[PDB]
Amino acid sequence: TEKFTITEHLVPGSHIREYPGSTVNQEDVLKIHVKQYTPKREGPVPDDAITFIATHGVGLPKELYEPLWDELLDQASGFHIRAIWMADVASMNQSGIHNEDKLSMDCSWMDHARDLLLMINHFRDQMPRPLVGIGHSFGGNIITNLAYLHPRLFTTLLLLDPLIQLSPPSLGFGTDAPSAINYTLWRDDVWPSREVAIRANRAIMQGMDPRCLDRMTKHFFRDLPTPLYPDVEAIKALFGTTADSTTTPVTLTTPKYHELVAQIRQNFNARDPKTGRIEVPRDTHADMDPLVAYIPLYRPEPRSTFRRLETLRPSCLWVIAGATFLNIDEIREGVKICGSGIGGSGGVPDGRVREVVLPGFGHLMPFQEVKTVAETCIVWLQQEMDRFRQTERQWKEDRDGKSHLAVEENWYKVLKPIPS
Amino acid sequence: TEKFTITEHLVPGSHIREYPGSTVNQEDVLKIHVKQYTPKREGPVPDDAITFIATHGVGLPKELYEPLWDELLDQASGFHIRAIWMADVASMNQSGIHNEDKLSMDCSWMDHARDLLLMINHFRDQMPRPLVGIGHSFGGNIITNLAYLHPRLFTTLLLLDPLIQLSPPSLGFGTDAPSAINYTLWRDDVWPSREVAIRANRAIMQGMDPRCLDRMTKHFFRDLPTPLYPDVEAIKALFGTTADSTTTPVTLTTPKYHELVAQIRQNFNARDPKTGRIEVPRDTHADMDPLVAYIPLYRPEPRSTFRRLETLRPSCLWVIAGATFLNIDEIREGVKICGSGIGGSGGVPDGRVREVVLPGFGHLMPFQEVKTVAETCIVWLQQEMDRFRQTERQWKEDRDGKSHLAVEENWYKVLKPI
Numbered sequence: 001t002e003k004f005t006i007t008e009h010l011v012p013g014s015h016i017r018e019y020p021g022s023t024v025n026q027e028d029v030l031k032i033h034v035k036q037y038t039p040k041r042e043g044p045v046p047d048d049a050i051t052f053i054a055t056h057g058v059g060l061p062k063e064l065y066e067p068l069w070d071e072l073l074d075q076a077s078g079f080h081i082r083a084i085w086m087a088d089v090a091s092m093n094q095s096g097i098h099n100e101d102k103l104s105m106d107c108s109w110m111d112h113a114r115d116l117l118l119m120i121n122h123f124r125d126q127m128p129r130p131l132v133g134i135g136h137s138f139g140g141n142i143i144t145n146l147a148y149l150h151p152r153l154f155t156t157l158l159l160l161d162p163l164i165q166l167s168p169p170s171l172g173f174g175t176d177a178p179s180a181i182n183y184t185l186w187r188d189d190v191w192p193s194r195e196v197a198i199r200a201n202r203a204i205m206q207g208m209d210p211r212c213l214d215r216m217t218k219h220f221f222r223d224l225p226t227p228l229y230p231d232v233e234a235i236k237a238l239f240g241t242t243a244d245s246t247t248t249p250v251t252l253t254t255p256k257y258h259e260l261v262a263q264i265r266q267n268f269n270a271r272d273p274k275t276g277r278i279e280v281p282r283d284t285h286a287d288m289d290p291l292v293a294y295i296p297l298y299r300p301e302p303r304s305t306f307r308r309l310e311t312l313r314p315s316c317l318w319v320i321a322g323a324t325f326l327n328i329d330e331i332r333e334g335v336k337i338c339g340s341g342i343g344g345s346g347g348v349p350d351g352r353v354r355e356v357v358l359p360g361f362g363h364l365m366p367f368q369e370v371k372t373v374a375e376t377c378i379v380w381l382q383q384e385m386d387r388f389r390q391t392e393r394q395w396k397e398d399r400d401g402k403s404h405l406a407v408e409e410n411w412y413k414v415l416k417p418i419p420s
Numbered sequence: 421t422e423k424f425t426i427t428e429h430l431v432p433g434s435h436i437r438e439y440p441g442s443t444v445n446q447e448d449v450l451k452i453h454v455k456q457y458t459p460k461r462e463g464p465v466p467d468d469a470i471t472f473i474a475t476h477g478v479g480l481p482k483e484l485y486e487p488l489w490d491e492l493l494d495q496a497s498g499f500h501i502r503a504i505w506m507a508d509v510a511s512m513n514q515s516g517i518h519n520e521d522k523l524s525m526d527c528s529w530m531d532h533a534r535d536l537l538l539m540i541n542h543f544r545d546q547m548p549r550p551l552v553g554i555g556h557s558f559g560g561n562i563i564t565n566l567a568y569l570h571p572r573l574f575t576t577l578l579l580l581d582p583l584i585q586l587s588p589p590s591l592g593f594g595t596d597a598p599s600a601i602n603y604t605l606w607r608d609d610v611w612p613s614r615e616v617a618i619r620a621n622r623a624i625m626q627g628m629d630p631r632c633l634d635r636m637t638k639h640f641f642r643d644l645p646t647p648l649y650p651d652v653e654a655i656k657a658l659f660g661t662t663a664d665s666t667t668t669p670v671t672l673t674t675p676k677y678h679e680l681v682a683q684i685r686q687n688f689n690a691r692d693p694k695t696g697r698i699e700v701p702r703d704t705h706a707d708m709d710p711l712v713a714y715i716p717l718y719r720p721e722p723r724s725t726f727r728r729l730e731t732l733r734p735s736c737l738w739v740i741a742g743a744t745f746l747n748i749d750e751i752r753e754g755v756k757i758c759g760s761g762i763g764g765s766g767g768v769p770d771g772r773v774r775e776v777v778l779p780g781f782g783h784l785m786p787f788q789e790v791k792t793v794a795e796t797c798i799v800w801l802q803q804e805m806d807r808f809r810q811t812e813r814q815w816k817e818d819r820d821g822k823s824h825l826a827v828e829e830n831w832y833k834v835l836k837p838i
Contacts, residue, residue: 003565012541013571014541015540015541015544015547016551016570016572016573017572018547018572019572019573020815021819024824025519026548026549027544027549029544064463084825089489103821103824105822105824105825105826105827114537114569114570116539117534117537118541120435121432121434121435121538124435124447124449126591127435128446128447129436129446129447131436145832149569150434150436150534151438151530151706151707151760152436152437152438152439152440153436171835172835172836177794178837180833180838182835182836182837182838183838185827185831185832185835185837186832186835186837186838188762227825228825228826255825255826255827257825257827260527260827260831261827264835268830268834281424281796282764282765282766282770282772283811286571286733286762286763286764286765286766287571287763288762289762296834297834297835304762310624313706342658342706342707342709342724343706343724344702344706345702345706346706347700349426350702352702364638369685391703394703395440398735402525404444404523404525405525405647405648405675405677406523406525406648406675406677407525407605407677407680407681408525410686410688410716411605411680411686412606414688414716414717415591415592415598415605415606415684415717416592416598416600417598417690418592418598418602418603418606419598
């Protein structure tokens with residue numbers, strides 16, 4: 001944005017949502033709001049320039065990642081950027097505004113993977129190989145599932161504190177501490193002014209890069225009226241600001257309820273009332289592991305995604321915040337298994353998977369430590385792009401003389417004729 | 421079809437193919453040739469009418485399934501048909517002709533699943549719920565992988581002799597008999613006339629419904645020139661027919677090579693030349709199980725698909741030919757595990773998966789036993805659509821009066837404050 005032309009797009013998402021309650025009508029057409037970042041460039045675009053497909057964390061507007069994009073371009077070494085594409089998940093940020101009359105109270109992370117697959121097919125003429133995935137937080141989970149949908153699509157993945165683990169989050173059950181999820185349900189979500197809203201959200205903004213602070217104050221809050229708060233005057237009356245012409249009340253651009261149903265899903269019907277035994281109800285919770293159904297809330301995708309990691313085809317960089325809320329020990333087992341099985345890159349033994357744990361960094365490192373996050377990504381991208389150039393050349397060499405119309409001679413040596 | 425209006429479409433498939441050697445250039449846009457079959461109807465379309473998404477077997481033109489479509493409509497009981505959609509896989513049949521300057525010598529079955537997902541999003545306005553998948557042979561494998569891509573997309577699947585099993589096919593290695601796959605590589609693929617081609621292919625057409633015979637003689641053969649045989653006069657010279665100016669040589673519409681690289685994939689580089697040990701080369705064969713790499717040919721999709729069956733979300737009908745050449749015993753283990761695990765329908769224990777083995781039927785039963793294949797499908801569709809109507813109603817009931825904007829009160833009971 002220092003360094004990029006910005007093009008905005010609104011494209012239809014995937015037909016039929018994973019959970020029927022995620023929209024008002026099951027055939028609703030959700031749109032995703034996309035920003036395409038094209039470097040300001042003198043010369044033509046180099047042949048191996050990367051298309052980046054990026055995904056954000058829950059409630060975090062795509063615009064927050066712009067300083068990270070500027071840093072990737074400014075520090076780029078051994079690769080070029082064709083463009084960076086980041087969409088807002090359909091239920092959040094600017095997508096949520098466009099879809100506000102069609103959204104309802106459910107959310108599957110898997111839908112954004114299908115929404116991105118459609119988007120890539122829509123913009124294919126601007127997205128030749130190589131493509132690289134970047135995913136922050138639940139976006140790390142989504143971009144991994146997009147690689148499961150299309151294994152050879154991405155040359156590599158950059159995961160920034162990805163939500164991929166076996167253990168349910170802490171939810172204040174029994175002796176457990178409440179987590180950010182408890183905070184999400186109960187938090188204030190409307191304020192007499194944007195100034196007051198900023199101060200009420202100081203925890204999330206602490207240590208943010210100033211460039212990220214400006215984007216937060218613009219994108220994280222929305223002036224009334226909204227569907228959730230359709231009556232400006234009733235809210236000015238509640239706060240006693242009816243006389244003050246110079247202040248407009250604001251609410252969360254992403255309603256707390258849309259953050260909540262993305263962070264966690266109801267499991268309100270898991271127990272047979274007569275035996276008290278867990279019986280997974282397949283009509284609504286077929287995706288739920290019975291082992292996690294002991295509490296009335298669950299999140300299926302971290303655990304299903306973890307269990308398929310051995311199949312992950314792209315090479316994968318795992319950037320972990322040392323001061324994260326994720327189950328870091330489970331994540332490091334995920335790194336060890338990543339790409340080691342059938343369909344896999346070859347994983348850690350083949351140098352196709354790397355972990356970088358950044359001590360003292362938090363979950364919001366892409367907004368708090370923009371330069372170090374960028375630098376960690378560049379070192380990996382340069383290694384992967386050296387390998388890409390070499391393997392692309394070896395491929396072209398091995399194919400040079402070969403027919404497009406008939407099989408090579410070795411087939412006639414290995415597959416014998418039927419006895420005449 | 422007389423019972424259906426036919427609309428033809430040509431739509432772009434999935435960007436970036438699973439195997440780089442599938443096309444001339446990795447960013448090539450392959451198109452799929454689709455037929456949309458809409459019942460001839462006086463009245464409006466009933467509300468729960470089914471969109472069928474159907475996939476064919478290797479080298480079998482989509483038009484061969486038209487008698488089965490007529491039979492499904494004619495025998496329909498307890499369901500309506502909104503439309504049946506069948507596309508030709510990009511490398512075959514009419515799709516292959518449209519794509520002939522872009523195709524190359526490789527094929528992943530997974531790409532047609534992604535091509536179908538795009539097609540469904542393209543035609544979404546004509547495809548409200550419910551959708552049902554029908555897949556014959558490798559099409560049974562593809563439609564299952566489409567259900568893996570989008571678990572809630574299909575209300576049910578009808579698999580007709582699906583290629584879902586653990587074991588490699590027989591390929592004449594060691595003591596094994598050469599199979600249809602050996603036949604595919606070595607078979608005649610050009611004839612001095614269509615009349616001679618038809619006579620030479622009596623074996624494949626034996627027992628076919630007469631409606632299927634006319635479609636076979638039209639769609640199974642193509643007049644030269646084609647890319648593989650671009651020179652009519654060179655082929656008339658090969659057969660010594662140069663004096664007969666009015667007769668045109670024909671070739672297989674689907675080149676035998678496109679059948680072959682869909683039936684089986686080269687594994688020419690699996691063994692370290694020094695240790696003689698299998699080392700899977702991850703740049704080209706990352707999808708290969710080392711346990712099947714002992715022979716220089718493999719097919720990854722039957723085995724990968726089998727291993728994920730416990731996750732299959734839609735209810736599933738498995739129609740098995742009693743005289744099939746598939747590993748029938750492996751298929752019946754697949755049926756038992758189908759939908760039994762996380763993400764699954766609930767499988768056989770919940771009545772969501774059923775096998776029907778049709779004694780003495782072969783792999784080409786959709787063209788040889790049109791009435792019985794249709795009847796087997798109808799009985800299942802009726803049960804599944806009764807369940808759909810009931811579960812759709814219970815869903816609407818449970819949602820009546822609930823907010824689209826804020827969560828229900830129980831959330832404040834289970835999730836404690838700060």
